[model samples]
Target chain A: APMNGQVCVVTGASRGIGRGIALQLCKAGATVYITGRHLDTLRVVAQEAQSLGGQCVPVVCDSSQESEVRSLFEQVDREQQGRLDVLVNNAYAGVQTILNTRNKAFWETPASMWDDINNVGLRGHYFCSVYGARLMVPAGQGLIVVISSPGSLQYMFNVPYGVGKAACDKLAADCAHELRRHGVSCVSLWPGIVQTELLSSAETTELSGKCVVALATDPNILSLSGKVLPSCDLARRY
Target chain B: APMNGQVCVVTGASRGIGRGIALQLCKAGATVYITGRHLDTLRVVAQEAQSLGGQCVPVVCDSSQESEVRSLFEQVDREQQGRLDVLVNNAYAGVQTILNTRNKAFWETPASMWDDINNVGLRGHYFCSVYGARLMVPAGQGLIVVISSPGSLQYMFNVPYGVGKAACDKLAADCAHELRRHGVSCVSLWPGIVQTELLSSAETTELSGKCVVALATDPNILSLSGKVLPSCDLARRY
Candidate 1:
């Protein structure tokens, strides 16, 4: 109940880490708004959260569409009286595509792969942060979490995937730089070997969720703003 | 004369760092192909290089357009007998806009700012690399230089600018990872206090050019591939 009465939004919450994060935030007594392209899957997660005595609202949204993302925050603003304590950007659509073309040279992959990976993964996060900031800046307190990866520093899956992750980290850092004076914090989170639908060990995924919960509840979270924190390290500390 | 007989392509060579790099390469006896959106400006640079007793070809190119970028490499392939020794992905279109919006909170900036900064800056660089790689891979010897900056590691002028630069660095690293086996090397080059039209001290811009020349001329450049190298350090070493 650390996040009791807090309002949080988690993107791509239908499954995987996003879903786990949403459930964790809900269990902490936050009114969580979870978004994904499929309403049915989102509803299932929402029901699971409810069964845990937590509130989770399912909203069908395609984060790649700018207007839809804008509408999402607008709806949250209207319902929450302009109070948004946390915004988690975790939507991604490049995994399957990256896996399909794993060993191929970047030039060998279709140029459209850039758009397929970054449009939702990187650009969408920027849009959500912009909209989320609109509500949080005035309220004078909030946290923006960018779900980035170790690939930001080194080569990972491929060109587009690594590029997107690096951009996400920079997005968090730069946004934090501007938002610091406003008392709104932003940081990039890296989850180790997560157990998602694709793969994982379960603890890291939920541990990542717990990290978010702890960050949102921390009074001095601003001190860690703009830093890239790993879930395992955070788990050890918090 | 270290780069004598070399064939190089420098994007956004109409002016600034790109122009400086192109001119320096031409001075070293390389056949340089420079691209920019404005034909007149590119012609001026070409003529300047010509005055220096070097062959400089001006190609009008808007790097944001995929087809235009493709045709550029195609032209290089034909004119150079399928020989492309170096590629400098230096085209950028975000400086003026980022300067205009400096100090404003990211949320205060327009959402279109992301595309404005990244379309030609980050995404276009990827496209150029792809086309450039097509020619380089077959040549069994080539260098792809991404003219990135320190902003890749820290908060810079703005969110979009930092994000684009970080992505550029990662793009080089990731591409290098795959292209190493093919004998093509990719590196992210950072110039310190560059003397461009906007701002500078002359040595840094040309120093960046010298760094590129040295990188291309070094037989063991593959060892430095996937690394982010600073011009000043390269200048000292070379």
Candidate 2:
């Protein structure tokens, strides 16, 4: 447990990749704080983290909902024994059938859908990181981990998703600039093709069942502090 | 000529790649409007275009100088015989060697460098598209191209350049959404390893000299709109 006793927060902590991250952090010995829209589901995850021998607390906060987000962070401030050590920025989902998108292409992907995804992917990360960095900077050190993707590399049919992920990497770089001077670092980590519930529902394939656990606990995972990384190669290569 | 009588307004047209693109368009037979800080150099390029068998008009405008940009377009409204065909959004350059960039590894980079580049890259594209799209939306169809780089994708050191390019793509996406409803399209065109005086000056080498010119000048380039394209790939594939 390299992070034993450190206080950490994970946004969008209810399910899928965020759930995986929260559990992993608890196993690594950090006191974990998780937030999400569903309070019922949030409690179960918190209970699971506690069973793993790490302290766990669940805060019901949907990042897209401003008041909930503010109250969630407020609770973390009230409950933590010390400074927040690590912040994992993760969250987003869009239940939609984009029609104008196919004909007019990505431009017509619908603004509501764009806003829904951007709220968590871009806005969620920005608000959290800005506040998190402010907290960590005073303590002389900390880490920010943003789960990111290749959407920033080019424009795709999914403009909102691409822009949101791309914004995160830039946000991390910007955070690194200010945070490094204060003995802190922030990096966007990319866990390539993780078999989360999201991926499971999207695919009916056997490989998704293989479960890439080796990639999750890779040692070289800590290599770059301000760039995006693919965990699978890190585990095998190192 | 795919752009016969298609009108284009190229800012930063007095020199460098902007000048290069102006020349390319003229050679391909489009009536071109060249703009920049220097009227003398712009005049030469415009006349040079005239000598190359296309109509050329030199207009003085500093994109950062908004009133001047507005006036330049007013002239386009008065003189252009047909609908706006193409808009190339690229302008701005200078360096302020001291300021913090978000990328600490590229820590040597200054905030001023970022400010100037962002002014030209992001804001320049933003305003260019706003005005061009407003005009083209009414006319029913047109193409907008933002000259860009991989730095925007964060594979390289130019973080400010990246911010500008990234936002340019986002700005384009936002515009695409609005314009698709009106029959207009915007694409962020990337010119990878373009060999110009500045690029050659960056780290002079045979590899830098290997850049493909035909790729940048290809008329059907807009077919790959809203994308970041490598020069050779566009040339080879398209």
Candidate 3:
């Protein structure tokens, strides 16, 4: 039996953090609606979820497109008998070369870099948050989880990546206060360093999956709705 | 035994948050060096601290004034026997009116308000930090505390205030990481809705005094050397 029959929608589920988050949520007994830009990989992931007796549905949708976002929600609503319980936005398209950035002066840094990063990371996160909040508002409850980074603080020489992350946290923080005025919870989980496709591709260290989920479901989580939960302690005791 | 033998410096101690912080540091038994633009007020504060049997030295040096900050230190180096342990930067000055802002729109928010606030806030905080770090690097340690606000998270809608505070946090965060790579510890703290003289005069809620010191004195505070802290939490815990 599905525990609470919670319906969860996850974006960028082709692989990486999104996939891990999706799998974790599914294991927790939620019918997961995973989305990505491609159909083949999406179907494969959905099939894998179903094999485990999880109600996993793969929906092909490019979240950057507003129409695509609306249609994705429409289908989710139709599939879930007109209801949504959770939304996880973990979509991102970025390349790593920022550290060796030749730009010394702050203004020399490309505004386009931050803009593009925000376009993909921040925008996609907010887009889902808007629709997710609307649905949650009507039912008087829901959670929107944004997978952000510790780069939000500690501005290194990398301007765009740093600023984009900071702006994302800013929006989350502002919306957290404003949405509380209504009745929705907006949280951003900071997975210190997780072992995933992205990490492997970036050639970063492999991290523990349990650590990522531990912070995501922290007991003292709400205390930091819009705040950054850095890596010192990501996983849990229980 | 009093924590008094240690030398502590508080900038912008002539008025506002700086004065409050200076008073508390002095009461904690530190040899307090309080500096501000006005000599009389600094003297009065010094006398008040001395009345409490705390060694207080008033230096009339405008924190925003470079030569003054340098000379202020030289005097402390000569007078205090070279034991500078705590440096609290609580001084700031700017046109605080929102309608008087120079920012055009959301995009220009960073240029106008954000840049301005950060320029002033960061200038004071950085000047203090760079100098403080230089001094502490050799001795293998010292505490550098930059007093900022929730604006670091963009809590304040005012762009200058928010952006300025963000810069302060970034400065401290990176400085913390970098200095820790060396030997010093740098931290920034965001005081809550403090009922300072200005706040009190404005009829805002009263939340000052031991509430903050209680937070600062908590044995667990050593753990927060590299992070920004909330005054309410500091007040309760310290």
Candidate 4:
């Protein structure tokens, strides 16, 4: 119950890493708001958490739409009484597309691929962070977690994917730099291969959730702000 | 005359680092095609290069427009018979806006700032690289340089600027990864504070130009591909 009484928002939480993180945060006694395009799937996850004696709210939100994102945060602000402990930006739509066109060079791919990958994956994060900061800066405390990957440091998938991830990492660093004085922390989390609907076992996914909980609970978390940390390393340390 | 017979394109060459690089490339006996939005300003730079007994063609181009970017490279391909030896992606419009808004937290700034900084600065580079690669890959020799900054590694002026630069660096790395087999080299260049219309001494600006020339002329350039390099270090070594 490290996060007891806290309120958190996890984007794209119907399944995969986001879902796992939401479940963990709720189990830790946080009121978790989980968002996705499909309300049915979100409700299922919410019910699963409720069955475990945890509080989880399901909200249908398409993060790519700016109006929807803004509305989601506004609802959180009103319902939670302006209490937002953590904001997780993890709504990405590029995995299947990337896997479908892996072998081709970037130039050979459709230019629209950039928008498909980054509109929700990178730009949405920026919008969420900005909105999230509006609430956190006044309260003088909060955590903004950007779920990035090792691809930020090297070439992976394709041009737009790597570019988007790299931008995500820098977004965390620069946002953290500005948020430091405000006592809000922002960090990029790189999770190893996880068992999501697309791939591995749930342990790794839940481990990432634990890392987020630990980071939120850590008093010295500000010292690690703006840094990119791997889940395995954080798992061992926390 | 190291770059004699080379055909190079430097975008946003009306002034600043792009102009300096274009002039230096022409001075080194290369046919430099410079692009900018204003014809009058680009003509002045072209005349200056021509006065030095160098071939410099100025084409009014707004790099943010995909059609214009495509046409620029198509013209290059036609005029040079598919010979595109070097491409420097330096068309950026964020400097003045960033300086004007300095010290403001990103969330406090207009969200349009992201489009303003990255539309031409990062996304444009991707388009140019794709078009440029079409010519270079067939010729089996070319160099693509993304003019980034130290901001890619850490925070600098603001979120959008840092994010754009980080994406630029990754664009180079990922492009290089794909271009390696085609004998093309791509690298992100970080230049020191240079005397330009906005700021220091021309020595540093021109030094970046020399670094690009050196990189394009190096026989083992592919070894340095996919790297983020400092112009000062390159100047010392070359």
Task: Please state every model's RMSD to the true fold in angstroms.
Answer: 2.6, 8.7, 12.3, 2.9
Candidate 2's TM-score on the B chain: 0.79
Per-residue alpha-carbon lDDT of candidate 1 for residues B47-132, written as tens digits (9 for 90 to 100) = 98877756899998888788898889999999988899999999657778887887777899987788788888888898899988
DockQ value of candidate 1: 0.69
Residue B154 in candidate 1, Cα distance off native in Å: 1.8
The candidate maximizing DockQ is 1
Question: Residues A55-78, candidate 1, lDDT per residue (tens digit)?
Answer: 888987788788898889889989
Q: Identify the superior model by TM-score, candidate 2 or candidate 3.
A: 2
Docking class of 4: medium
lDDT against the true structure, each candidate: 0.86, 0.60, 0.60, 0.85
Candidate 3, chain A: TM-score against the reference: 0.78
Off by over 4 Å in 1: A195-203, B1-4, B194-203
- Please state how well chain A of candidate 4 matches the true chain A, as a TM-score: 0.95
Q: Which lDDT tens digits does candidate 3 get at residues B143-219?
A: 77777767776556543355456656765666666566445666677665343322252121123324334434444
lDDT of 4 by residue, B150-187 (tens): 77877777898889888988899899999999999999
Predicted structure with the largest TM-score when compared to the true one? 1
In terms of lDDT, the poorest run of 10 residues in model 4 chain A is: A192-201
Each model's DockQ score: 0.69, 0.08, 0.05, 0.60
